[PDB]
From a paper:
Whereas the overall fold of the catalytic core of LotB and LotC resembles that of other [name]-DUBs, both showed apparent differences in the helical arm region, which has been shown to serve as an S1-binding site and interact with ubiquitin. Based on the catalytic cysteine and histidine residues of the two [name] domains on LotA, we analyzed the sequence and found that both [name] domains of LotA contain the extended insertion between the Cys loop and the variable loop (179 and 178 amino acids, respectively). Together, our results identify Lot-DUBs as a novel class of the [name]-family with longer insertions in the helical lobe region.
LotC lacks this S1’ site, causing the VME group between two ubiquitin moieties to be unable to reach the catalytic cysteine. During the simulation, the C-terminus of ubiquitin (Arg72 and Arg74) formed transient electrostatic interactions with LotC (Glu153 and Glu245). Remarkably, a single mutation on E153 completely abolished the catalytic activity, which indicates that the electrostatic interactions are essential for the correct docking of the ubiquitin C-terminus into the catalytic pocket of LotC.
Numbering used by the authors:
A (entry chain A), B (entry chain B): 16 to 63, 66 to 180, 186 to 254, 260 to 278, 283 to 302
């Protein structure tokens, strides 16, 4: 139950700092309407311990939605900033590399023998991008109608590369060249049509059935702290030490604490 | 290079999970003094790899020695729990079965013709127990002077089980009776004098010239996870998915990775 627990824990940190500047700045990052910013600041006074009623009627409806949207949207911007580092890349790429292996051999090409991929690796099996509605079907379509050009592009690139000839150090190079090509297929698929599939993923993560992962938590908390990299250098807006606990275990002193119960139950814990 | 690589892999796993108690439990299994537990604790911070200086002045001296010791003592513990299952049994028994063929021939007994053993079988020729200092010498002595009693014991058991006359099924039954006797010889020789030769193997495994086998790897990892069978039921203390890569190849998601380069060089791999 991540965004709820994040929200609750974020309210304890605000009421604890008693600063309208940090409070207002973070309200801004969540883009909250001033009507809602009033309901929350009422809670920031009267310190003791938030009621079940303050949570169900004030914190959950306002900061639940807003933190999920901030996590969603900030997933997108991290991807655009440096896409090969993101989980979404390597998850989607693992699928693109598996579809192309199947479509390459269907197209009677020797390039299939360069992909070792069974689409069963547990690191990728449950990636949320695979549950985006219609996405994988559009991925199959994309892999089919793009495979002739891919083979073309591999042939082109291979012939430029020729120069010993180990007959196993020369399938190194087929593999690497093909991997770079497919890594570009992965990003292009997401960036097509002013980021149609990328926005499709954003909307999926704004859906309420989608469990926030520990992955999305870290995006959220970087968005909340406003962590950036800007020309002049990495700049922050707040430093908020966060600690995750796992099945009660514990790991500077932390200002926000969540307990992660085997990735099923999120609870926040007041420091 | 196994204990070093196991140790490195164990610190990546530790640092990654960030639980004081999982950490402290495993330090307990490794029986480390609080002095050394602290030098490691420093290393499990500022995770956002480890330097060669951290490895060779901190991780290797502390965990290298402790994991070897743990692997060794736990070799002994498994043997005592169920000795015929351990490879130490199967290797020592193959030697004992070969020495007894030689000694029974020397004592001009027809029993030597029931033993099928050239001592050449490669599965057993490289057995670490054979390299234990003095051990095979003590074994010959033991076999030479125990042989009259063994002939004695085979004759006794043979008389008792006589009940017919299949011949094709007479060498069978002599063979089996003798094999059981020799298997008891094998264990006795190790448990004699309060487990003197068994402890001599333990100390051999502790001497740092002894290359960690792949077999010893799995003992250590069962000890680290505190695997046991207890009467309430086989119960664990941790589950730590380990994976071995073999000459770079790959096999749920793994928390420790070692690469085993054809049993000459061990390296760990951050997941
Ligand atoms: Pt939630
Ligand atoms: Pt994390
Ligand atoms: Pt992170
Ligand atoms: Pt973090
Ligand atoms: Pt940067
Ligand atoms: Pt080693
Ligand atoms: Pt192994
Ligand atoms: Pt094993
Ligand atoms: Pt058992
Ligand atoms: Pt294993």
């Amino acid at each position: 139950c991540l965004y709820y627990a994040y929200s609750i824990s974020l309210m304890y940190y605000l009421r604890a700092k008693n600063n309208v500047k940090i409070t207002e700045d973070i309200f801004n990052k969540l883009g909250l309407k001033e009507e809602d910013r009033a309901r929350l600041r009422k809670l920031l006074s009267k310190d003791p311990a938030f009621t079940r009623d303050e949570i169900k009627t004030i914190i959950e409806p306002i900061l639940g939605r807003a933190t999920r949207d901030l996590a969603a949207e900030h997933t997108k911007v991290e991807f655009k900033s440096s896409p090969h580092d993101t989980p979404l890349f390597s998850s989607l790429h693992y699928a693109v590399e598996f579809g192309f292996k199947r479509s390459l051999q269907i197209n009677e090409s020797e390039l299939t023998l360069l992909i070792d991929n069974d689409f069963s690796n547990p690191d990728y099996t449950e990636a949320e991008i695979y549950k985006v509605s219609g996405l994988l079907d559009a991925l199959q379509e994309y892999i089919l109608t793009r495979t002739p050009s891919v083979i073309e592009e591999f042939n082109r690139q291979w012939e430029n590369k020729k120069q010993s000839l180990t007959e196993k150090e020369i399938q190194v190079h087929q593999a690497t060249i093909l991997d770079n090509i497919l890594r570009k297929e992965t990003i292009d698929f997401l960036l097509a049509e002013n980021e149609k599939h990328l926005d499709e993923y954003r909307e999926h993560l704004r859906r309420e059935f989608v469990w926030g992962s520990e992955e999305t938590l870290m995006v959220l908390h970087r968005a909340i702290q406003g962590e950036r990299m800007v020309r002049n250098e990495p700049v922050y807006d707040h430093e908020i030490i966060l600690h995750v606990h796992r099945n009660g275990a514990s790991p500077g002193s932390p200002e926000m604490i969540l307990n992660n119960e085997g990735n099923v139950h999120w609870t926040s814990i007041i420091p």
